Design a binder for this molecule. Structure first.
Ligand SMILES: [K+]
Ligand SMILES: [K+]
Ligand SMILES: [K+]
Ligand SMILES: [K+]
Ligand SMILES: [K+]
Ligand SMILES: [K+]
Lengths: 259, 259, 259, 259
């Protein structure tokens, strides 16, 4: 099948004419558009342009549509070329995406009034329950700032996306606490003056020993509780120092991408 | 020796004909297979394909079999080319790999019964010992989840592989604790009200000061115990913050590779 | 428009003559300067030089001035080429930048005297206020070392530049402490022996639980205070372990760039 | 000056003959050695070899000796080429490097005897001083293992090399402790029940608050001591989390390079 020669600043490219006919609207696929760059003396089309980029521009046609930016070609440059060669806004975006008492009442009432008002205006434009209700509505209040603080949105999108990541930290943390709250429970017990009788309390210690917080409300006195204490102080920093790189790589990405 | 010219979208490659005969089954090595792409006018074989990839495709023959994917060529693309040129499933994989009271009894009995049953069904398809036995079988129980929790397998494979890494953390931790539990022992002693008489107890402090847990069950009161305490708080975070990058790079790899 | 051919060690480049006339002072743009490298037999200018670099050297003219160093070309090499081709000191720098009781009184008086003297010599060359004044002038004294200690300058430039980064850590820390000092306040209260009555004190705990310092002056005794305590020990290490990579990447850069 | 053409698997290179004469012993510089690869029909030397590598092989001569391995060319491959082209062992290495009661007495005496014996055999093949002598010889004893433990050597070489790095951590730690042990000293004092009278003791707290160890032997009770306590818990983790990446990058390098 009749072949074409494209010269990009001395670098010669060759393809069949049907390969370019696969995208009739692009500059190279449109006879009338590329006609301006034909050299009758050499029988080739010449372009005084960026050499590194054309590799992909041609592969686009041969691949049926794949438009990847060569790793060694800047983003601003390669974008200009896609524009010049007239690849089309569709493929253009596809590339883009593939590439990237009273005072308390007054304050409480004023907010409920403003919030509801603003909410409605924008939208339109028993004894035991009282204990659980105050901890809910009053505690999650801070979440309102997320609507005016860019940072929170980033923190949220990262959590929603890296949920599987966090799920491991907690999971691994469990197996850890369970294994340590048990290994010390068997060596800490059967000894007087030891504040490690039950297991439920051994859970707190472990959670306080793995995160390295160490309040001092519970500490091993026996030899068997210290051996598992050292392994715990280590296993903790080891287990915790895992999902971090992931969440950070996600946050830093969501942060840099949003900004 | 008679040479051949291969034109890949304008980029010309040249090699001897025996070099290609070294792999008679591949497309380029098989006369009958490459015959379809010969251009009589130019005396060369033409391929309307990916330019960046062919560099390696040719080196494969010249190297006697080495099939490396150019750093600047996507994985999905280069794979297609290996397929087209018909390099062979062997070399193909080789590339792949080179590239990547009653309730307690009931619960206890039910499990032992189910586990043993499931185990057998799947397979077929004195006073001091009682103290060490309860800490063993009962503590390692959690390890059963590893068979239904992907995460654990990753954590295990990383440990089994980065064993030499962890061995250092503990090793370095030793030398550290030994050096600190001794430097403070000589400056903390010979002083009343000091809870640092013996060395074995100095070990606990050091292990609790390097991991930065600091329960508060032991703290320097002398000037010589604080100087070594500062160096300890530092040396600890320095020694611990070493094998981490390795274990993480292993975990993150085993995690991303498994997923 | 009359075209030119430039041969760089066998690699042929082609451009129009006006493209090179866009920078009349450079070697390639100056007829008298490039005349020395013209080959009459082939009708092309030949240069026995670095191939990888010329890609950019030519793009410079086609782009109207863009001078980027190819990712695969060393800095010392590409710099030499820019010099040879005589691109010009301007574009040269632009590239550079786009690329990178008595003793107390005596001591106090002597300093004030020396400092003021040195300052002037270099420049030319009520009861409640006394409490706030001593904490100010006397505390910020150390900042004087910054003028003789390179390290501080780096620490400062990184802070001044990554201010938005730090602003998040503190911000996120707030929302965290507010949410935790409240979630535990509702579960820690309504229970005797609990040292978590007020909220202002719950703030201290949270700040001491998220940074993982854990002095032991405050710890959850209830079940509801421990559940939020575990989430706090985690959320803390998660929130803190975020701006770090940024500040470090800034510090390490400012450090390596300054040195 | 008479020019030469080198064809590397279809990729044509051109240089002057003197450029190659600059290294008379290499294959390309030796008439008798390159004669075997000359093609009389095309007037060029042909090599059925790796294309990516030759770029550097030629630059070596043009540069007067610079032998850099292209970023996109494997180490094992490029090495083979340097060998084939016969560049010379010198340049070869240069490239390599540019590229990479009684029991106590018995035990004490036996060691002193063995050590001194082994030392000599290998080499040949008052009251206050007693307090400082026991802390020295007895404490640094562990350092003997470094001769049989690879890990320590790595830890040492990294310290000796990244000394300037560590010097900052300690330095920055100083300025920090000095600024915090002073900011809290002015707000913690003038208040009863406060364990922060003197400054020397404020130093311990700061060092225990920045490393996040928090023994609990000292904690702010005033409002002014807590505000500076939060800034301290942060500034600490910020200052410490700086030299880490450096020491790690050095250790990981010294570790991977040694192994
Ligand atoms: K800690
Ligand atoms: K701690
Ligand atoms: K603590
Ligand atoms: K504590
Ligand atoms: K305590
Ligand atoms: K940490």
């Amino acid at each position: 099948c009749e072949r074409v020669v494209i010269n990009i600043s001395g670098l010669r490219f060759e393809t069949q004419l049907k390969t370019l006919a696969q995208f009739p609207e692009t500059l190279l696929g449109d006879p009338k558009k590329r006609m301006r760059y034909f050299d009758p003396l050499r029988n080739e089309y010449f372009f005084d342009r960026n050499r590194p980029s054309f590799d992909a521009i041609l592969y686009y046609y041969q691949s049926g549509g794949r438009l990847r930016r060569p790793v060694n070609v800047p983003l601003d440059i390669f974008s200009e070329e896609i524009r010049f060669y007239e690849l089309g806004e569709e493929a253009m975006e596809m590339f883009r995406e593939d590439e990237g008492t009273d005072p308390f009442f007054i304050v409480e009432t004023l907010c409920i009034i403003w919030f509801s008002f603003e909410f409605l205006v924008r939208f339109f434009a028993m004894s035991l329950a009282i204990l659980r209700v105050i901890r809910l509505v009053r505690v999650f209040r801070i979440f309102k700032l997320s609507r005016h603080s860019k940072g929170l949105q980033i923190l949220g999108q990262t959590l929603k996306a890296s949920m599987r990541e966090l799920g491991l930290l907690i999971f691994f943390l469990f197996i850890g606490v369970i294994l340590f709250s048990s290994a010390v429970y068997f060596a800490e017990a059967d000894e007087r003056d030891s504040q490690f009788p039950s297991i439920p309390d051994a859970f707190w210690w472990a959670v306080v020993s793995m995160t390295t917080v160490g309040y001092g409300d519970m500490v091993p006195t026996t030899i068997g509780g210290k051996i598992v204490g050292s392994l715990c102080a280590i296993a903790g920093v080891l287990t915790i120092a895992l999902p971090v790189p992931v969440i950070v790589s996600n946050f830093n990405y969501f942060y840099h991408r949003e900004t």
